[PDB]
């Protein structure tokens, strides 16, 4: 019996998360883990904020704040956001945890000890007016492909994606604009080549899709250049070595980050009261823990190559309990990117769907539903507002919500909300109870295969099946002729609602508890279905979902989207709506300030 | 060995919580429970949203939304807010839980069964244009003391506090203004008189303060009028009785609400995996569970009289395990009200400090610190912005934060962050380690006595003691003469920081983890102090707290306070600040909209 150690790529504590992030590695992981829990399986779901690296440091000088100040701010912002998103991480830690410092440092020390490292002195950047080295994101120059002013790290705003700090033209320190200087420095490196073979061999015998497995093999087919794992940063985890040359140096966040996956788990079992249980999840003791890594496509290389090697370089974990080895990525589910109304998410262009903002106007189920509806699985998908409301209202409201409502509304009208007893069953009755079985079976398999968009579809169809059932069983007619008959229809219909109650859970937790209350159940939610007993008391018909409005979308676009990118807003607005309508919404939404918005989006209007 | 069943008054799901609420019953409870946990004691901390009652129903017709829609919205808003507030409820449920429905209904049925009830028909309100009864908050008329138009429930906006629905002049249904009608109805009542004696007797033998114990006794000294526990509402828990007269009737929220205290706990142990542990907390088995009820003064009567009786009326709980009785309120800590800048919190006047808004500009420690600083213990206290910043900056920043910073900054300057070994100890060294003991001892006692304002003070003084220590031990001098000496000072100083790390926890969780990371500790936080070992590696000097700004307060007042109550804002602004300063802050804070604010607060300015 396998147990599961599930993680989600650590979000960087330099900003808030957007739907691309969620759709990319959190929502999938949540859907998967919830399922596993309903299955009764043994799974741990971990995550936390990545709090080191040049960026965070950069931003600190930028806003004149300590790197600690900002990560403390974003850890809270993100942890709460995930709670809002209903992402059930068993624990959400942070790489600022003392234990992370200890484990990373050990990790590095284990690499020292197995001669997988190599000190090296290189000539590198510097500022004399600021008396400090100038790592990655401090580069401030022209581009490496196109030629634009001011380019940092490796993302751009031009065409540029990945522009090493040196291929940049006119190197000038970002902090003060002083043209860079060159001071040589010492850093330790990892002889990745030491694991190329062992890696390739391991990758061979593994259930990953060729589109990855292979491309990975290729990438390895040409040596692994010794990568540096140290940095000249004033923020981060100190390199253990007590020498004078390694003073004021830190472990490349690039190296310690993944170790966070273990650090946090350990932290989890500590505070949970069972200090040593973590060992069975990350250590290959009587080996059989499937370690899953939900990530974004960009993380495949790292997770299928370097991270595994970092683990190997620590050959032996060993004290007071088995000297076993670290497990390796069982699987590394990755998702493509997400676009917004035809364009890519852009923090620069301030064009994205921020979870915390979006969740201010729409319920979590809506964001979770639609996003799974467009899960960037095999390719990229495009978030669209017209697409969003239409799927919710047409699918979630008109179908799932509709069925549930009808069902209850009937058991309440003809039986005073008491579950009728079932008489003989004809073909449909027989087929309906079978469909319930089919769903549980198939949805479960689709999930274990990372086919969420299709898994959610299998569920919606069951609701679709329920509607049909009702539509052509006509309880409103049958009730004026054959009581017993209607009783069956009704009882059967509710069975489908209870089932839809458990099946939905992994996808929409809230619409799940909503249904459970309507059915009035204490029953611990589980994947093994059990019919609703006759004589069971159900609650009065409530509503499941309220249709998305244009008033809402406009309010959203105007209130968030707009200031940050007025043109983006304007283009969206007079693309879906008439200006005479937006004004009205704006007027009856922003009181004595509506006017100082409309003019802000529609360049000139007064 | 006692275990503790701690609760906080269920917040009503009709709106967000404000500092008065927090200061009144949540913050106290949190400080108490955290302590208990650090003490290693066995405590359960429960709470959830009260989701029934006329109000919620009212609001529903008001905004044309189902009562369920709104409670779902506020349960999320409040649960997240509490997370933001760092209130560690072991579980935050809701009275919409199926189990609540079951337990309440049983409770009522147990009262039926022990003849503590009495059906009665009364002539009551109605609307014929709306074909519905008109309970409490539907009353819409002139006042009962002063004479003002439109008065609902029992709170006012005039002078009025508690105006029974009938003493109101010109009774007109609130929904449509149609002057009320009178249709007789049947409701069950509880013969409170049946418990007067048994109550008074119980209250006698109990450790409550006379100012309560007595006033309670008086209140009881004149019969307990049979109170109605049923209602003509379409939203709520159905009365079990299957009769045609009790159809469409519900249990007065007033009756079921407290039962939520048990419902949720049960729900807690269910989902936690240990289904039956709840029995030992609410049932008096081998009796010794101290049940504490953190509430507001307004709740004393209810919690010391009716709630206990409701418990008695259920004489026997009994199946498959001991037929024991429900425990009774061990203690019922209550706090006075809170005022804002000299005036009372007012949802009507839109004058209050909303936790979720306030926590958008200031860290949770700041709100928790200041509020405990003004805990409405023996009387009412007044929240004030000048008072807020001054205490934070002068106390939290300049003292606690200052000490911590100095300490680390030294162990890092003269020992490369490594804990020095202690040599001979003189009087101060000896006294310093003793002070640490004293603090733990006294703070702990002050907490167990609900003396938080003083408990927090005992802690700040320890930090104050640390500063003095340092000030007159002069490490910066001693380091250029006697190494060993400085080592002691330093080692000692850090002991005080680690201690301040645990002591703070109950009050400021974040400044607590901040200190723990600086000290670089894995050690599970506990109330039993253990010195920092020599040779221990501490982190580089960070900052603990950033001083509150005027830019912040103005931004807050302008961004939240203002629209909702522009006059309130204006009066605050040009009372603390010059208009030429507010403008600047407003201009460099609201970009292209600053102008449409300043004019909104300062009536005319252009
Ligand atoms: Zn470029
Ligand atoms: Zn510079
Ligand atoms: Zn009045
Ligand atoms: Zn009316």
């Amino acid at each position: 019996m396998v147990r599961y150690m599930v993680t989600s790529a650590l979000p960087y504590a330099n900003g808030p998360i957007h739907a691309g992030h969620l759709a990319g590695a959190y929502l999938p992981a949540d859907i998967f883990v919830r399922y596993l829990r309903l299955k009764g399986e043994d799974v741990v779901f971990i995550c936390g904020t990545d709090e080191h690296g040049t960026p965070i440091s950069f931003r600190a000088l930028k806003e004149g704040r300590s790197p600690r100040e900002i990560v403390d701010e974003f850890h809270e912002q993100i942890k709460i956001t995930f709670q809002r998103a209903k992402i059930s991480f068993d624990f959400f830690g942070r790489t600022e945890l003392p234990i992370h410092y200890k484990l990373s440092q050990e990790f590095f020390l284990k690499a020292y000890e197995n001669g997988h490292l190599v000190k090296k002195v290189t000539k590198q950047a510097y500022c004399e007016h600021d008396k400090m080295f100038l790592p990655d994101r401090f580069v401030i120059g022209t581009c490496p492909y196109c030629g634009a002013e001011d380019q940092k790290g490796d993302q751009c705003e031009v065409c540029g994606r990945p522009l090493t700090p040196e291929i940049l033209i006119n190197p000038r320190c970002a902090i003060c604009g002083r043209p860079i200087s060159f001071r040589d420095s010492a850093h330790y490196y990892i002889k990745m080549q030491d694991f190329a073979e062992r890696l390739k061999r391991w990758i061979e015998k593994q259930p990953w899709k060729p589109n990855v497995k292979n491309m990975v093999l290729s990438w390895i087919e040409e040596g692994l250049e010794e990568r540096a794992i140290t940095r000249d940063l004033n923020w981060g985890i100190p390199v253990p070595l007590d020498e004078e040359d390694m003073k004021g140096k830190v472990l490349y966040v690039w190296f310690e980050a993944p170790i966070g996956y273990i650090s946090i788990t350990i932290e989890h079992f500590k505070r949970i009261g069972k200090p040593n249980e973590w060992k069975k999840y990350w250590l290959n003791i009587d080996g059989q823990t499937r370690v899953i890594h939900f990530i974004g496509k960009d993380n495949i290389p790292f997770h299928a190559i370097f991270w595994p090697a970092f683990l190997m370089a620590y050959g032996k974990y060993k004290d007071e309990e088995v000297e076993a080895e670290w497990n390796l990525p069982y699987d590394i589910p990755a998702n493509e990117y997400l676009t917004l109304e035809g364009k890519k998410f852009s923090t620069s262009r301030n064009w994205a769907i921020w979870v915390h903002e979006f969740l201010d106007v729409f319920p979590a189920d809506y964001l979770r539903y639609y996003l799974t509806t467009i899960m960037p699985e095999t390719r990229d998908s495009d978030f669209s507002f017209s697409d969003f409301k239409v799927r919710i209202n047409e699918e979630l409201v008109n179908n799932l919500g509709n069925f549930v409502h009808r069902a209850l509304t009937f058991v309440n009208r003809y039986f005073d909300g008491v579950v009728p007893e079932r008489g003989e069953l004809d073909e449909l009755d027989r087929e309906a109870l079978e469909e319930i079985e089919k769903a549980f079976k198939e949805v479960g398999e689709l999930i274990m295969n990372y086919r969420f968009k299709d898994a959610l579809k299998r569920v919606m169809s069951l609701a679709s099946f329920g509607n049909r059932y009702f539509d052509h069983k006509q309880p409103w007619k049958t009730a004026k002729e054959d009581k017993v008959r209607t009783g069956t229809t009704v009882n059967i219909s509710l069975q489908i609602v209870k089932a839809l109650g458990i099946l939905l859970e992994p996808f929409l937790p809230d619409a799940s508890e909503k249904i459970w209350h309507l059915l009035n159940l204490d029953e611990v939610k589980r994947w093994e279905f059990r019919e609703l007993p006759a004589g069971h008391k159900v609650r009065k018909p409530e509503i499941l979902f309220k249709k998305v409005t244009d008033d809402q979308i406009i309010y959203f676009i105007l209130n968030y989207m707009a200031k940050g990118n007025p043109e983006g807003a304007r283009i969206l607005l007079d693309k879906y709506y008439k200006r005479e309508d937006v004004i009205r919404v704006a007027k009856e939404k922003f009181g004595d300030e509506a006017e100082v918005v409309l003019r802000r989006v529609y360049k000139d209007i007064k």
Side-chain angles (χ1 to χ4, degrees), chain A residues 108 111-112 116-120 122 124 136 162 165 186-195 199 219-220 222-231 250-256 301-303 305-307 309-310 313:
Chain A
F108 169 75
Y112 192 81
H116 287 296
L117 305 191
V118 38
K119 187 134 84 82
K120 293 178 61 186
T122 290
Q124 283 170 323
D136 347 65
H187 288 84
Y188 287 92
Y189 297 59
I190 185 175
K191 294 191 285 293
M192 283 298 300
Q193 196 53 60
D194 296 10
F195 318 83
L199 285 176
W219 263 61
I220 309 177
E222 62 296 336
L224 306 180
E225 64 171 2
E226 2 93 60
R227 291 216 166 306
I229 72 173
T230 303
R231 279 311 179 67
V250 59
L251 299 180
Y252 195 178
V253 66
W254 177 82
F255 173 73
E256 43 122 327
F302 189 73
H303 280 281
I305 292 174
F306 314 104
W307 160 230
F310 298 163

Side-chain angles (χ1 to χ4, degrees), chain A residues 234-250:
Chain A
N234 230 280
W235 177 242
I237 312 181
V239 327
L241 308 177
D242 278 25
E243 324 183 319
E244 185 105 321
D245 53 330
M246 286 308 295
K247 83 84 194 296
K249 308 202 74 144
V250 59

Side-chain angles (χ1 to χ4, degrees), chain A residues 12 28-29 176 213 368 391 397 521 529:
Chain A
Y12 201 62
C176 74
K213 187 172 176 294
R368 285 171 68 104
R391 304 225 202 199
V397 178
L521 305 173
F529 188 73

Side-chain angles (χ1 to χ4, degrees), chain A residues 115-130:
Chain A
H116 287 296
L117 305 191
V118 38
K119 187 134 84 82
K120 293 178 61 186
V121 175
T122 290
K123 35 155 125 177
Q124 283 170 323
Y126 209 77
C127 179
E128 308 253 25
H129 165 237
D130 287 353

Side-chain angles (χ1 to χ4, degrees), chain A residues 165-211:
Chain A
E166 310 296 29
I167 187 73
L168 286 187
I169 299 168
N170 291 182
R172 299 174 189 171
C173 174
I175 293 175
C176 74
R178 283 259 78 202
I180 79 170
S181 304
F182 283 117
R183 259 67 186 29
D184 45 303
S185 180
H187 288 84
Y188 287 92
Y189 297 59
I190 185 175
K191 294 191 285 293
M192 283 298 300
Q193 196 53 60
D194 296 10
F195 318 83
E197 213 57 32
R198 181 161 155 51
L199 285 176
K200 202 291 179 57
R201 295 289 77 84
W202 158 70
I203 287 174
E204 300 288 52
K205 296 189 64 178
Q206 219 155 200
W208 305 353
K209 69 183 69 164
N211 280 185

